[PDB]
Amino acid sequence: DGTCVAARTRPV
Amino acid sequence: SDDLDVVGD
Amino acid sequence: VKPNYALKFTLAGHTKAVSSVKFSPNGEWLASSSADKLIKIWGAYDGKFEKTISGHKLGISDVAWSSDSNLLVSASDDKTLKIWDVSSGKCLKTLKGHSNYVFCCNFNPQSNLIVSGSFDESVRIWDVKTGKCLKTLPAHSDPVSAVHFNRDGSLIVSSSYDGLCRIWDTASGQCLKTLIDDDNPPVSFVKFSPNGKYILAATLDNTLKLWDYSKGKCLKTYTGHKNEKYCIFANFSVTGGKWIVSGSEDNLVYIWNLQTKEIVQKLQGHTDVVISTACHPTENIIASAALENDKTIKLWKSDC
């Protein structure tokens, strides 16, 4: 859901 | 000379 | 003169992008972290799923082993790190202090300390036993992408999107050195060599560089891969021949000859960006992991 987020797996 | 030893020394 | 890594196992289980993979120092286990908020443990040699560890409130960007292979530390978007007892699955401590996403983490060799880097632009040094923040370093002017101790734990190297690598005295907290090239694009990863005298750094202009710490100059550069968007890990491979290993945004694992800087292998199999690779401590084995459209981990083996 919306909590499944991590900075390294998102592009700059 | 251009070789680098990254483990030892 | 060339390695011949070949796919041996594919490890599926994470339900979101994988963020990091690391071999335990004793060579028995692989740990993985993911945006799915989980750490998973796998057999290093056979890839067999071992267990899941959970507790973070948001996803995880990094995980790292203690020197004795008994603990892990994880870095999460929930602004905390957690220390885990691997055998029990217990969260031993939650490390609170950072004011934004925690991005990277490592134990020192003695494993009484943990170092972390965050989107809050600081590097923090934590006591493992008590879980208290010992030092906050005003390290950078942009997010901190990587942190690493040298072989004796006396130094810490940090990297940042501000274009800098900095070297810190663990005991004093003093900045001893700032590495500056002719151009300074965002630095997306950094680590010391095993002997501590060189520094391997990734930049978001498709370039890895090997620096001499003491002279403060770049000696070798490795290119041919794609890296402009993600903080992709890099490794020294030293069990067989001397290689540099890195993931790439074209879905491949790139391997370079450390000395000649030539690409010696490109490993095909992943279907999304390869965000993380690790090299096994004693055996010629590589682990790789991919982002959201793939979500699998792969184990590759070579004869040298």
Swiss-Prot record, chain A:
Say which species the protein is native to. Homo sapiens (Human)
Task: Give the record's disease field.
Answer: Koolen-De Vries syndrome: An autosomal dominant, multisystem disorder characterized by hypotonia, developmental delay, moderate to severe intellectual disability, and distinctive dysmorphic features including tall, broad forehead, long face, upslanting palpebral fissures, epicanthal folds, tubular nose with bulbous nasal tip, and large ears. Expressive language development is particularly impaired compared with receptive language or motor skills.
| GN (gene name) | KANSL1
What tissues contain this protein?
Expressed in the brain.
* Record's subunit section: Component of the NSL complex at least composed of MOF/KAT8, KANSL1, KANSL2, KANSL3, MCRS1, PHF20, OGT1/OGT, WDR5 and HCFC1. Interacts (via PEHE domain) with KAT8 (via HAT domain); the interaction is direct. Component of some MLL1/MLL complex, at least composed of the core components KMT2A/MLL1, ASH2L, HCFC1, WDR5 and RBBP5, as well as the facultative components BACC1, CHD8, E2F6, HSP70, INO80C, KANSL1, LAS1L, MAX, MCRS1, MGA, KAT8/MOF, PELP1, PHF20, PRP31, RING2, RUVB1/TIP49A, RUVB2/TIP49B, SENP3, TAF1, TAF4, TAF6, TAF7, TAF9 and TEX10.
Can you name this protein? KAT8 regulatory NSL complex subunit 1
Its subcellular locations are: Nucleus; Chromosome, Centromere, Kinetochore; Mitochondrion; Cytoplasm, Cytoskeleton, Spindle pole
Quick one: signal sequence residues?
A: none
Curated annotation (Swiss-Prot), chain B:
Task: Quote the subunit structure annotation.
Answer: Component of the NSL complex at least composed of KAT8/MOF, KANSL1, KANSL2, KANSL3, MCRS1, PHF20, OGT1/OGT, WDR5 and HCFC1.
Q: What does this protein do?
A: Non-catalytic component of the NSL histone acetyltransferase complex, a multiprotein complex that mediates histone H4 acetylation at 'Lys-5'- and 'Lys-8' (H4K5ac and H4K8ac) at transcription start sites and promotes transcription initiation. Required for NSL complex stability and for transcription of intraciliary transport genes in both ciliated and non-ciliated cells by regulating histone H4 acetylation at 'Lys-5'- and 'Lys-12' (H4K5ac and H4K12ac). This is necessary for cilium assembly in ciliated cells and for organization of the microtubule cytoskeleton in non-ciliated cells.
Source organism of this protein record? Homo sapiens (Human)
Highest taxon of the source?
Eukaryota
Where would you find this protein in the cell?
Nucleus; Mitochondrion
Protein name, UniProt field: KAT8 regulatory NSL complex subunit 2
Swiss-Prot record, chain C:
State what changing D77A does.
Strongly reduced affinity for histone H3. Significant decrease in interaction with KMT2A
Q: Which residues form a coiled coil?
A: none
Instruction: Please list the residue ranges covered by the WD repeats.
Output: 13-52, 55-96, 98-138, 139-178, 182-223, 226-266, 269-303
Which consequence is recorded for altering F233W?
A: Strongly reduced affinity for histone H3
User: Which controlled-vocabulary keywords does the entry list?
Assistant: Acetylation, Chromatin regulator, Host-virus interaction, Isopeptide bond, Nucleus, Repeat, Transcription, Transcription regulation, Ubl conjugation, WD repeat
Q: What is the predominant subcellular site recorded for this chain?
A: nucleus
Where does it reside? Nucleus
Q: Specify the superkingdom.
A: Eukaryota
Sites of N6-acetyllysine modification: K82
* Sequence position, cross-link Glycyl lysine isopeptide (Lys-Gly) (interchain with G-Cter in SUMO2): K16
The record's SUPFAM superfamilies line, in alphabetical order, gives: WD40 repeat-like
Q: Which PANTHER family match?
A: WD REPEAT-CONTAINING PROTEIN 5, WD40 REPEAT PROTEIN
Give the family, as the similarity comment puts it: Belongs to the WD repeat WDR5/wds family.
The UniProt subunit note reads as follows:
Interacts with PAXBP1; the interaction is direct and links a WDR5-containing histone methyltransferase complex to PAX7 and PAX3. Interacts with HCFC1. Component of the ATAC complex, a complex with histone acetyltransferase activity on histones H3 and H4. Component of the SET1 complex, at least composed of the catalytic subunit (SETD1A or SETD1B), WDR5, WDR82, RBBP5, ASH2L/ASH2, CXXC1/CFP1, HCFC1 and DPY30. Core component of several methyltransferase-containing complexes including MLL1/MLL, MLL2/3 (also named ASCOM complex) and MLL4/WBP7. (Microbial infection) Interacts with herpes virus 8/HHV-8 protein LANA1; this interaction regulates the MLL1 histone methyltransferase activity on viral DNA.
Functional summary from the UniProt entry: Contributes to histone modification. May position the N-terminus of histone H3 for efficient trimethylation at 'Lys-4'. As part of the MLL1/MLL complex it is involved in methylation and dimethylation at 'Lys-4' of histone H3. H3 'Lys-4' methylation represents a specific tag for epigenetic transcriptional activation. As part of the NSL complex it may be involved in acetylation of nucleosomal histone H4 on several lysine residues. May regulate osteoblasts differentiation.
